[PDB]
Amino acid sequence: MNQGRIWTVVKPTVGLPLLLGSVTVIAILVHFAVLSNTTWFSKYWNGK
Amino acid sequence: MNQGRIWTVVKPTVGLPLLLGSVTVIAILVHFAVLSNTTWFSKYWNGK
Amino acid sequence: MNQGRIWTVVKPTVGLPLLLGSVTVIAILVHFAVLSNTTWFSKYWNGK
Amino acid sequence: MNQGRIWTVVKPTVGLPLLLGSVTVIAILVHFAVLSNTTWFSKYWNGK
Amino acid sequence: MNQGRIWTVVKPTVGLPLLLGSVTVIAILVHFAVLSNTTWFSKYWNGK
Amino acid sequence: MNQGRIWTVVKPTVGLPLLLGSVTVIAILVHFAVLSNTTWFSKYWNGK
Amino acid sequence: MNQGRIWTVVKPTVGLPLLLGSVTVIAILVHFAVLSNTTWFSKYWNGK
Amino acid sequence: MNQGRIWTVVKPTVGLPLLLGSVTVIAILVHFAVLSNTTWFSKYWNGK
Amino acid sequence: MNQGRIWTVVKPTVGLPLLLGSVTVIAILVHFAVLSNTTWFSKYWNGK
Amino acid sequence: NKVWPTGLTIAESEELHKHVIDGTRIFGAIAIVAHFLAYVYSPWLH
Amino acid sequence: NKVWPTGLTIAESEELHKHVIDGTRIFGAIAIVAHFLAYVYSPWLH
Amino acid sequence: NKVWPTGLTIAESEELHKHVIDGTRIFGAIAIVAHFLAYVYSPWLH
Amino acid sequence: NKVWPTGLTIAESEELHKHVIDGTRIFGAIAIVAHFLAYVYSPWLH
Amino acid sequence: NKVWPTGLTIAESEELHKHVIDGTRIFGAIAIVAHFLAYVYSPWLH
Amino acid sequence: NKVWPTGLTIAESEELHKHVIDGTRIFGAIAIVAHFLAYVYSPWLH
Amino acid sequence: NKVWPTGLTIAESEELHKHVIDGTRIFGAIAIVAHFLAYVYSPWLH
Amino acid sequence: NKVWPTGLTIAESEELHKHVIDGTRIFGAIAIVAHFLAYVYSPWLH
Amino acid sequence: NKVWPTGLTIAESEELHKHVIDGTRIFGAIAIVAHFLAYVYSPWLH
Amino acid sequence: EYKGHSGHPLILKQEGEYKGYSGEPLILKQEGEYKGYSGTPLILEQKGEYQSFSGTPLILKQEGEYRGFSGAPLILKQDGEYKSFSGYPLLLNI
Ligand code: BCL
Ligand code: BCL
Ligand code: BCL
Ligand code: BCL
Ligand code: BCL
Ligand code: BCL
Ligand SMILES: CC(C)=CCC/C(C)=C/C=C/C(C)=C/C=C/C(C)=C/C=C/C=C(C)/C=C/C=C(C)/C=C/C=C(\C)CCCC(C)(C)O
Ligand SMILES: CC(C)=CCC/C(C)=C/C=C/C(C)=C/C=C/C(C)=C/C=C/C=C(C)/C=C/C=C(C)/C=C/C=C(\C)CCCC(C)(C)O
Ligand SMILES: CC(C)=CCC/C(C)=C/C=C/C(C)=C/C=C/C(C)=C/C=C/C=C(C)/C=C/C=C(C)/C=C/C=C(\C)CCCC(C)(C)O
Ligand SMILES: CC(C)=CCC/C(C)=C/C=C/C(C)=C/C=C/C(C)=C/C=C/C=C(C)/C=C/C=C(C)/C=C/C=C(\C)CCCC(C)(C)O
Ligand SMILES: CC(C)=CCC/C(C)=C/C=C/C(C)=C/C=C/C(C)=C/C=C/C=C(C)/C=C/C=C(C)/C=C/C=C(\C)CCCC(C)(C)O
């Protein structure tokens, strides 16, 4: 909340796509991590 | 519905390909996830 | 049929290769998925 | 046959190497698929 | 704290995205390392 | 021998490296394929 | 201490991020090596 | 010894790095192949 | 000691990073090779 | 108004974003139907 | 009208998009038949 | 003030970063609700 | 006629695409023969 | 002073690096707390 | 004749492609010998 | 003196390398400590 | 003679390729000895 | 003499390459010692 | 003109406009504002400063030297030469 000068030196053409991208990549990885290492999430999809 | 100015600073030649692309890559990854980690989807293709 | 202006802002030298390429890559991936996860498509090549 | 204007908007310096290259890559992938998922292609090399 | 001249010769357009990015990648890798090589972290998610 | 004009629209600085390079990559992949899927080639190195 | 002129011909915009980045990557690899190939480092995190 | 005009159409700044690099990448791949598929080379390092 | 002119046609901004980088990558690969394929180097870290 | 570094004006960008949101709402509508079918014809919540 | 940043007019873009849609409809038509063949000659729904 | 090398003034940069923070606060709000749901319906903290 | 953004006229593009289609038809014919040979010797349909 | 090849003066570089160091020290502060919590709630040293 | 977008004339392009054709023939001749030797010494067809 | 192709003089490069060397000496010093800690607390040579 | 698109003349290109030829001969000459040693000391043909 | 396409004269290139030769010799001289230590303290030839 | 080996024709070409094989229309015209399908509105028109959600404040101003949240100092100054932290010399010279 005090860093807002950052876009004077980091170009938003790289900044926003890398921000919006890597945050989504982290979300994917956390879902894969919990999926690979828990029974309850795997069972949730398997249903029944 | 507030960000309509983003294309003034993120170039559509990268923003729109990455948007449409990564949404598809997410859909691929969710399909591989449910396929690899469920019986019923694996069975659905094996048929009978 | 509603989006036909997209090529005013997405350059065809990238948007057409990426459309044709990714549609092919999606097809390759669905084949490898059904191959890896079914008996009959594996058996279909193995013959007899 | 109607698409012969595509090279007015997709540059041949990329479209031709990608077309020839990806056709070769698709060929390699279909060979590796049948090689891995069939006995007879594997046995054809193992000989006797 | 000696190196404050570095941005005279390393461009912040590359410097800051790599610095923020690789630190985030290192954080991910250390979580995957401890997740793979410990019972208690995996057991923490599995719950019960 | 019809395509003698291809180097008018595909630049030799890319076409010749991609040609010589990918041919070599194909040779490597075919060697690895026969190595992975035959007893006699593995035995040819293992000796005696 | 002889190579002080190397930055007259290697551009710091690439040579410094690669020097800092690769040394970090090397360090990450040596940690993953010793983690995978030793009991005690695996045991150290598992604790008790 | 007939191709010596190739450097009029393939730039040495890419052709020489690709040559020296790929020749080394080939040598690495051959060593990994003989290592993974022979007893005597695996034993040569183990020594004793 | 005959190639001293190579830097007239290979640009030091890439040839020096590629030389120093790849020589390091070679050393990493040889260490991983000897590590994965010997008892004594694997044991050296594990102690005793 | 000025052309910004992407070459669009603010008004052109806002007209562009009308497509992105309409497309996203269309994608949402199809996906909600696809989830309803996947609920009816799979054991997911069932 | 003006050339937009891609170098196309709106009319040249819309004339181009006719190709992209015709190609998609041809691809869709072949795929519908290929699914019917796979339904007949495989256990998928059968 | 001057345009900096990215082509934004300080004031334009600050008005951009307002969106990044508001976006992050909206992301954080949805994520907290998602964690509350995942607590209520999973063995995570049980 | 004008040179389009790739540097080719429409006529030069269509002259190029005659090679791409001729190459595709040659490749298709050569591939059909190899599928016939594979059918003859392999158990694929046999 | 001159603009260096990155487009920043020395003083502009110093003003930038003050943010990087402050950000690093904030990251360090959060990490110490996160390790302390992990020490309390895991067998790590415990 | 004109230099085309690659900076070669048609005559320079054709004189280049003669090297590609003759190089491919030398590769083919060397490869055929390697397949013959492999047939003699391996069980491939043998 | 002349600017070399990287945009630095010899003296600016040599001053730059003073930072690079010192940065390695600091990294080396921390590493010798971290190895000594590992020798004391791990079985590595112990 | 002209500088070609790579910036070399034909003579500069051919004087370069003499290094590529003789460099390949030296690499070949070492590789023969390395293979001879491998034949002598390994069960390869032995 | 002229600057070649890399920006270096022949003399500047040859003065640069002396660093690459002696850098390789230093790396070789360390590597011979590292191999000698591995021969003494590991079963490689031993 | 290219002859080709796989017979004739090798291409189809069309005089006035593209005629589709998959029937007509191939595209929809748009005479004005975007006539979206998923109802309205499609955007919110920002007339002034950013009328954010998630409350206020939304940024903190900087009015001088940066006040580090981790205290001070944030930098060590340099004057006349690089003060080494690992002894001298740092460089040899030719
Ligand atoms: C010999 C194999 C040659 C070939 C040689 C010829 C010759 C010679 C002629 C054509 C002609 C035609 N070719 Mg051709 N052509 C081949 C590949 C193709 C393929 C493809 C593989 O997809 C297609 C779609 C076409 C398309 C066509 C039509 C435009 C046209 C047929 C009109 C006609 O009189 O019809 C009735 C059809 C016929 C008389 C013959 C049709 C032959 C079919 C198309 C061959 C298919 C390949 C076959 C199964 C495998 C051949 C293997 C090779 C021997 C190695 N060619 C290959 C590369 N083609 C003719 C033309 O221009 O007429 C005005 C013509 O004179
Ligand atoms: C079938 C071979 C061609 C084809 C040839 C034609 C022809 C011929 C016509 C159209 C017509 C129409 N086609 Mg078309 N079209 C194809 C692919 C498509 C696809 C698709 C997803 O595949 C779509 C959505 C469309 C869209 C449409 C509309 C733009 C148009 C008016 C429809 C209507 O309400 O008309 C009224 C009509 C009907 C209720 C029935 C029309 C059925 C059409 C002929 C076939 C549609 C696809 C079919 C159901 C599925 C694939 C079949 C297999 C390929 C065998 N085409 C393929 C590539 N199309 C019509 C038109 O332009 O009218 C002015 C028309 O007569
Ligand atoms: C196929 C149907 C269309 C659709 C057709 C319409 C129509 C028609 C109207 C709106 C209107 C609205 N739409 Mg819409 N809209 C769709 C998708 C969306 C989605 C979404 C995430 O999918 C959202 C958030 C919106 C947003 C909105 C609001 C801006 C607005 C007021 C809603 C309301 O409660 O109206 C009152 C309630 C209704 C009109 C009932 C239906 C509203 C809900 C939101 C639609 C849900 C669709 C469902 C998820 C998918 C069904 C798909 C099947 C193929 C049929 N649309 C899909 C793509 N939308 C309205 C408007 O402009 O008001 C001023 C309006 O008249
Ligand atoms: C409705 C959910 C909205 C929201 C709506 C509001 C509203 C409404 C107000 C603020 C206000 C504030 N918001 Mg907000 N805000 C949200 C998310 C955040 C997050 C975050 C990480 O998620 C942060 C750091 C902030 C930051 C802040 C401060 C700038 C300010 C005073 C906080 C305080 O002490 O309130 C103390 C508590 C109150 C004033 C009452 C409760 C207000 C709401 C619930 C925010 C409390 C903060 C808390 C972390 C939110 C968690 C929400 C749950 C995920 C549902 N908002 C989400 C997106 N925000 C206030 C403001 O600007 O006043 C002038 C205010 O009144
Ligand atoms: C509240 C936590 C804040 C913080 C708030 C402050 C405050 C407040 C002050 C400093 C001051 C200092 N800080 Mg600070 N600082 C933090 C993080 C750091 C870290 C780090 C790796 O995390 C470092 C290396 C520094 C560095 C420094 C020095 C430059 C300076 C003198 C320290 C000293 O001996 O004070 C001796 C002591 C004092 C004057 C009073 C007590 C201050 C204590 C010692 C601060 C310890 C922070 C500790 C190392 C890291 C955080 C622990 C976690 C919060 C659990 N800060 C975080 C972000 N910092 C001080 C300063 O400017 O001195 C002139 C000062 O007053
Ligand atoms: C924590 C200590 C500091 C440090 C503080 C100093 C100080 C203080 C001095 C030097 C000086 C020297 N330093 Mg220093 N230096 C460090 C790290 C290094 C490393 C390294 C790989 O880590 C190297 C190779 C050097 C190199 C050198 C030489 C150029 C020079 C002594 C030459 C000599 O023999 O003079 C003859 C011998 C002497 C004058 C006295 C003995 C000096 C000894 C040899 C310094 C040994 C440092 C030791 C290996 C670091 C331990 C790190 C960990 C704390 C374990 N420094 C670390 C970061 N350095 C000296 C100088 O500038 O001289 C003009 C000096 O007095
Ligand atoms: C891994 C596991 C187990 C689980 C993973 C779990 C997980 C993380 C899931 C995450 C899911 C996420 C995040 C989903 C996100 C989905 C989103 C964001 C969808 C967006 C869709 C966007 C569309 C459809 C855009 C269409 C644009 C269009 C049509 C644009 C048209 C533009 C034009 C015509 C130019 C006009 C020019 C002129 C104005 C001049 O006319
Ligand atoms: C992995 C698992 C288990 C599961 C995965 C499941 C999963 C996710 C599946 C997803 C599937 C998806 C998304 C499928 C999407 C398919 C689509 C979109 C197909 C599109 C086809 C488009 C075509 C054919 C375009 C041809 C364009 C053409 C020919 C253009 C020609 C242009 C010209 C001539 C230029 C004119 C210039 C001028 C003269 C006008 O100026
Ligand atoms: C692996 C395991 C087991 C575990 C992994 C554990 C692990 C490490 C987890 C790490 C997690 C981390 C780090 C999470 C970080 C999350 C963050 C940072 C989220 C950020 C969200 C940002 C957003 C939503 C930004 C929206 C921007 C927006 C909307 C911007 C709009 C801009 C505009 C309109 C331009 C205006 C132009 C003009 C001013 C001219 O008008
Ligand atoms: C995996 C297995 C089993 C085995 C693998 C084993 C294996 C191979 C290990 C290999 C290990 C290796 C090789 C390690 C090498 C480590 C090295 C070399 C470390 C170097 C550190 C360098 C640093 C810290 C540099 C900082 C520079 C800095 C901060 C520069 C600052 C510059 C400024 C301020 C600009 C000034 C501007 C103006 C001049 C105008 O004042
Ligand atoms: C996988 C298995 C089992 C097995 C794999 C087996 C296998 C294949 C192994 C292969 C190994 C190979 C090939 C090893 C090769 C090693 C080599 C070649 C090492 C070379 C080192 C070079 C160095 C250190 C250069 C330093 C340059 C320097 C410092 C340059 C300084 C320049 C300056 C100062 C600029 C001056 C500008 C001015 C002022 C003059 O204008």
Numbering used by the authors:
A (entry chain K), B (entry chain I), C (entry chain G), D (entry chain E), E (entry chain M), F (entry chain C), ...: 1 to 48
J (entry chain J), K (entry chain H), L (entry chain L), M (entry chain F), N (entry chain N), O (entry chain D), ...: 2 to 47
S (entry chain S): 4 to 97
Paper text:
LH2 complexes are oligomers of a basic α/β-apoprotein dimer, each of which binds noncovalently three molecules of bacteriochlorophyll a (BChl a) and one or two molecules of carotenoids. Light energy absorbed by LH2 is rapidly and efficiently transferred via LH1 to the reaction centers, where it is trapped in the primary charge separation reactions. Overall, the cryo-EM maps and the corresponding models of the four LH2 complexes are very similar, all with a ring-like structure in which nine α/β-heterodimers oligomerize to form a nonameric complex. The most unusual structural feature of these four LH2 complexes is the hitherto unknown γ-polypeptide, which partially encircles the LH2 complex toward its cytoplasmic side.
